[PDB]
Amino acid sequence: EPVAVVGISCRVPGARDPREFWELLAAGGQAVTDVPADRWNAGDFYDPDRSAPGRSNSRWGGFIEDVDRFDAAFFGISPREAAEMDPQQRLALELGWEALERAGIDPSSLTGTRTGVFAGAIWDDYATLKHRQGGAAITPHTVTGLHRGIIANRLSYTLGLRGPSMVVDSGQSSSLVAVHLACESLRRGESELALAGGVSLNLVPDSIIGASKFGGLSPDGRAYTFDARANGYVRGEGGGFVVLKRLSRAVADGDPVLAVIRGSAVNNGGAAQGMTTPDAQAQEAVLREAHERAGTAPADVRYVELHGTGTPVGDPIEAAALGAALGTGRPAGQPLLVGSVKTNIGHLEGAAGIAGLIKAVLAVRGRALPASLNYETPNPAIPFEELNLRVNTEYLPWEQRMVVGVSSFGMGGTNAHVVLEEAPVVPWVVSAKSAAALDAQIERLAAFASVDAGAVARVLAGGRAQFEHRAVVVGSGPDDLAAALAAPEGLVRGVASGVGRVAFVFPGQGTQWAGMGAELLDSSAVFAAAMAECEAALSPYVDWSLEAVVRQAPGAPTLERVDVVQPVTFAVMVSLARVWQHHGVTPQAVVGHSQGEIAAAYVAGALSLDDAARVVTLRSKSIAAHLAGKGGMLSLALSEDAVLERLAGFDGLSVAAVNGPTATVVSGDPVQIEELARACEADGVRARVIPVDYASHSRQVEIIESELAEVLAGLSPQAPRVPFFSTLEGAWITEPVLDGGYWYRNLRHRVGFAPAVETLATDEGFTHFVEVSAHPVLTMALPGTVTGLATLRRDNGGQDRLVASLAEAWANGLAVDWSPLLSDLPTYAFQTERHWL
Amino acid sequence: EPVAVVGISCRVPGARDPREFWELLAAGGQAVTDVPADRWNAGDFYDPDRSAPGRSNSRWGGFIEDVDRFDAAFFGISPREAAEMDPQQRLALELGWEALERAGIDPSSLTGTRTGVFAGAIWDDYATLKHRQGGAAITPHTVTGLHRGIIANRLSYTLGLRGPSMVVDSGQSSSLVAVHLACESLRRGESELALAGGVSLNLVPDSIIGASKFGGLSPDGRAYTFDARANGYVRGEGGGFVVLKRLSRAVADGDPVLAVIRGSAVNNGGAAQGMTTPDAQAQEAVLREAHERAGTAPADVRYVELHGTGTPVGDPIEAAALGAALGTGRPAGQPLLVGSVKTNIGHLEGAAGIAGLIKAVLAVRGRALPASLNYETPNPAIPFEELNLRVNTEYLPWEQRMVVGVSSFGMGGTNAHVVLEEAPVVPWVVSAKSAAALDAQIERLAAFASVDAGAVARVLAGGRAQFEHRAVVVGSGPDDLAAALAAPEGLVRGVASGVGRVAFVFPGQGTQWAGMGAELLDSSAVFAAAMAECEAALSPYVDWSLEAVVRQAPGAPTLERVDVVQPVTFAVMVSLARVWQHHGVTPQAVVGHSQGEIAAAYVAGALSLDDAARVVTLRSKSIAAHLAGKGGMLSLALSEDAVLERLAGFDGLSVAAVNGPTATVVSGDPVQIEELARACEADGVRARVIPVDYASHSRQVEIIESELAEVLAGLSPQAPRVPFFSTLEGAWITEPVLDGGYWYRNLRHRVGFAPAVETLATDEGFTHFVEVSAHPVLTMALPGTVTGLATLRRDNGGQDRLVASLAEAWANGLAVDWSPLLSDLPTYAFQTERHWL
């Protein structure tokens, strides 16, 4: 029975959104203005004589700013269709999206859901313009751009909603009827979720002429509702949506509940004293039926949001029905409070009742009742004391569940009444469909920050669409994030387009630093679990303790020797890959550089952790027992083509690695390494002698061959589960051929890393390379077109750096899921363009 | 859950009503024609080039005849408002009334009922015309004449319906959505009864331009639905209503059940391949949801009324969804039958689904499935055999409950599906709002008669409004009534206006005839009961038997003597008044003439039946024992003014009665009576010697005074419950002063009947005088302005005459209730006038 209002959006004459609407209401603000000069001239259609042909007694109204502006690209609408599209449809689209975002629901998540759309709409001023344009102005978009049911259906189409979708027209009750219909759709279980709302736009003078000939318009332009100056109403344009759910479903889904629709009723005036004369007894009947369905009694209903238009005929009849249904029955002298948002915003016509509903929701959320603005003397036609009714003349803090009624009456006598009871390091991730929209969405989130930083992060990560233009602000707490949203050039930014496949890169040398993973052992439970598993795997060989070396315990080795630094780097890389996969980034392939291949071979599933640990530990020990202190290595910023030439005259040298088409690595005898380095420094080139006492990938490695085959003989390699691009074979590895001989060849022969990345990038569609390392050493070597993503950096190796790397990956359109790292924040910054006939 | 369809009405291109619609369907008739020349020129807007500006590829459509004609007076609409009124509203009014009459419900009985109105409407061509007219054409009726919700609300207003009232727009599913909404309103108990329907009218070319630019229109003008020639649809205009009730309520109310809505569902296409592209999987989802709510399985659904438009994109998707939801699941080789009424009538747009629903109702009522007309070769895009679907190419008698589906899809992707199971002397009284309408309604009932005569009478008496122009045909049986509906100048006719108050007239002499009430003793149980009660009252005085005298038994008196004829006339008049009151005609007053006063005094409650019987019997016996054979009476067609003068020279005469201002009655000595009669015959006047051996109201009556006071002394008169106008005192009797002296004065003094009727007519507002008598003798004497109503006539005194008198009374707007005297008969003959902008 009870229906949660879980989200709201509105667009009303003085207010872009429900906070702005509440600010206007609490302030007692009046948004009735002159007619906009940009649509249609106020005075040219004005005449004080009600009988004057084709002219209105009213110069004033509630108007929405920028009804002609729409973000057609956001909804995938061509400018020609948007031009043909009724502004009511455009506004219902943007309102529907905003209202769902206000519920904290990503609207793109609703595709295929049984979500109903129930919209009230009754005016057709854009159709009036299309008609005035006459023949030949009709195009293939005219019919769908003007048909009013498309207001609901287009919203169902764009969001992919499969539930019922229809527009109701019962006049100025239509929105509240739509809410009633949505509520019954929820009670049947026909819908799991519903967008109930309505829209009206005063796009042409014809509607203010027809309303002035019908007669209801205030010659003063303000609705003195229930006041002795009740000279008529003023037209208003607006729209609103509520997102509605069963209260059980909303609480179970943890959705915010703004208010509960306890009950509602719809009836008609029937044989009133003329069709457009309101009927007090039919209004009583709606009040009573709705409150009965609400299971509610008068003493519980503290306020009614009037239909209250300030017409001299309508107000006494509404007051009489309220006193007969609610005022009497409440204790005498604690009256029912009443007011009308039409005293603030005018008569939003078809949207009128949703406006009253949203006002009431804001009143319960605010625990206060807004004033009615055009009220000095109680209308003498109304016996307010004898009804036990009081017009709420002042903002009243609302000190028993708070309960309000909302009434909406149509000119056709369709009455609706609804009873609302009151409700029973971190990333902020911002995304939009364009750079200008992204910048706007950042500026709005900064203004919002200008609060639970984590709850905001949950709403931004789970409750918002993930579009292609992405920024992330990463901060320790609310003000840290707020400051970092200033100077927004500092944010992580990126564009999620070409992603295709991801490769995990496992580097070799130069990635170590004292204390790598020490802060991460405390920060990340997955990393600590993986490092404990790696320590268990390594312990039958290393004699020391992995965690002791990482935490730099006093009695631990200090990463100075190879037989320590290589298994520690192996463990860190295995664990960091485990962390990446924990956060949604599984590798489509893995590629390793030198010893990194061992780590690759484990994350590919090729080698087992026992065997991977044995390989890394025993190869490192052989290096320390025979290769250490005997060789040297040298990085040169120069292509391997000229480098293989410069190796002439140095039989004790070789090319160790070709990391990119700009910088190679030679390895061999230390004296010849120094000779080549000095020769390069003679021609003015870049040369970086690598701090390594051994000479990997050289000839000297052959010395340890008779040792390696003795200690790696028992290996049992398996078929790689993840593809494994060997930079030794220079190609895919699809067979269990990673035995000890392979691990000797890897250490003895060149590293073909640039061939590997050129192959994976040009051929197999790999767009992102995630360097799973303690410090990036290879990402400055991939081709300019592939994305490179590091993990940890030197001395930046804690949770700060982990979330920075995950943010740079997810901004790169990677499958980052923010849940393992994790409230009225802004809705989408629509980049609205003018579209018109 | 199950909803009875209890009534239907439709107005479709070739058919005024559901019988005409079924005749078209069974005949395989096609009502698609050229565009009407009277609205807008076909060719001026035609161009074979779809791209041609402001022109349509289609010259053809389904059109309603006389969309501009409306019986505005019947609905109380001024010609100016009717002129402003959208023809869709006018047609929904007439359809709503007809549909309720088809249920056999008097629509005026529905005032204040929780009856919902649910209408689908989507086009606004009359608004298009009003808009084209520009400024200053807008009037106080433009807004209500154009607003689409008023289509529902106006019907709720005129019929006084208090239930919900709204128009739904979901495009070309809207009508069926309206039915779905009405069904859920019935299941909630929000409505006890609902009018669900829809309307669309092609009032302007703009809609056929916009539909040809959207592209769906058949360049051939015919919808080859599911056929290889599927070149598009053709537009159609129409309307339909179903009256819906809970099946339990309909069976309990004894309402006719035409079909049962077992279940329905509404969904949207959601993110279809474009908003206006149909989605086969969403259509499957509606089919499955609706059939689940129907508790139904494929083998039960024998036919589906397609949405089937003959567009080449729509038909394969609909066929695919049907085969996936119904065709497979039925046994292979006994396929699901399909067809489309759009092959007969084109696409009735917003009314489309109600048309399909009414067709299906007519199919279940008819136990046959109509053909689809534009179908020679199965569309090769559809794998009909692999779907197990067959297009019903021929009229198929439908030999397990019969079950059909109806599908309606909107261009906005709102899909609706509904499952219909098959259903689980006498007066004919004709009334209309005008003489021309009455004559038309008689001609229609004669054509209908051209059948259970009693069931027809029940439907005409209980199931039709009682308007002011009234006829009654009275006959022994169906053909007798049918013949008597020929030469309809013979009917009882009358006008129900001035009625004010009714007086029961109880006459004195000249009303007797041998055998009065003998046929009525057998025919009327109330009359026989009353006559038995009167016989019980009379028996302690009369020595004879009342029933024996009435049945003219052999040993009974033959009404020749006064002491018999007066108590028998008393009994007959008392009993006939009882009969009148049994049939709804209670007297506002009673007035008696001579001995008739005794009867009056009983029906007024003044005297009791024992005392009334004693008075009549003993006065009659005194008359026979002393007044009989001694006096004489004479009726003269002449005013009492000259008659009191002509009584000069005749001391043995007097004026006995002044019955009207034209004919008096003298009474006295027989010789002087004959002398006066001869004198009147000498001056050429009218003179009727009354066959009465006594001389009432004369001087001779004084002789019996000493007797009367001896036999009437014990009387206990009471206060008159019904007013009692004495024609002896010449005024009201409001005190218990009807003792024996009064009954002597009544017999001894004049009868002031003309004074009585002038007083009751001029003063107290009495308009109808019901002569409760065995033969009228006073009705030819009332003023020309009051209505006179007799009861029985001489030798016409059986049930024939009783129903003739009740018919003449009820045609005179008397409270006649036909129940104690008591099926697809015609609906109201609307006298439709052209109304337009």
Side-chain angles (χ1 to χ4, degrees), chain A residues 114 128 131 140 149 153 157 160-163 165 167 169 180 184 188 190 213 267-268 270-272 274-275 282 289 412 414, chain B residues 114 128 131 140 149 153 157 160-163 165 167 169 180 184 188 190 213 267-268 270-272 274-275 282 289 412 414:
Chain A
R114 292 166 65 85
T128 310
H131 299 355
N153 294 174
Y157 167 70
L161 314 183
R162 280 291 208 81
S165 181
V167 175
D169 185 354
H180 177 73
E184 297 319 313
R188 286 188 300 270
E190 171 181 70
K213 297 307 178 176
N267 93 353
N268 195 275
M275 177 177 67
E289 186 84 323
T414 293
Chain B
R114 292 166 65 85
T128 310
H131 299 355
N153 294 174
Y157 167 70
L161 314 183
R162 280 291 208 81
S165 181
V167 175
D169 185 354
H180 177 73
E184 297 319 313
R188 286 188 300 270
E190 171 181 70
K213 297 307 178 176
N267 93 353
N268 195 275
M275 177 177 67
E289 186 84 323
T414 293

Side-chain angles (χ1 to χ4, degrees), chain A residues 408-563:
Chain A
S408 207
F409 312 139
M411 69 180 164
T414 293
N415 304 307
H417 197 71
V418 178
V419 190
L420 284 165
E421 182 166 54
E422 69 172 326
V425 174
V426 52
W428 290 354
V429 297
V430 190
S431 192
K433 295 198 176 196
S434 73
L438 175 61
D439 292 344
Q441 205 74 58
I442 291 160
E443 285 177 31
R444 281 152 76 116
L445 192 68
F448 163 85
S450 77
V451 66
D452 180 345
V456 172
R458 276 93 168 276
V459 176
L460 292 178
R464 294 296 180 262
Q466 290 192 348
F467 300 124
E468 175 190 316
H469 293 77
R470 293 183 185 184
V472 197
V473 63
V474 299
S476 62
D479 54 350
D480 188 14
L481 296 149
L485 281 187
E489 63 266 37
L491 302 187
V492 169
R493 258 194 187 80
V495 182
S497 313
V499 177
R501 317 195 86 210
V502 187
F504 279 10
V505 178
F506 298 90
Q509 301 171 11
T511 49
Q512 89 259 47
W513 47 282
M516 49 184 189
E519 326 155 28
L520 217 43
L521 276 193
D522 299 319
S523 312
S524 183
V526 173
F527 183 86
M531 285 293 280
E533 197 172 0
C534 295
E535 181 260 338
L538 292 169
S539 46
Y541 313 109
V542 295
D543 188 20
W544 41 261
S545 171
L546 170 70
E547 183 166 321
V549 174
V550 174
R551 301 206 130 101
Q552 294 170 116
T558 60
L559 289 196
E560 295 187 357
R561 37 202 206 102
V562 37
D563 46 0

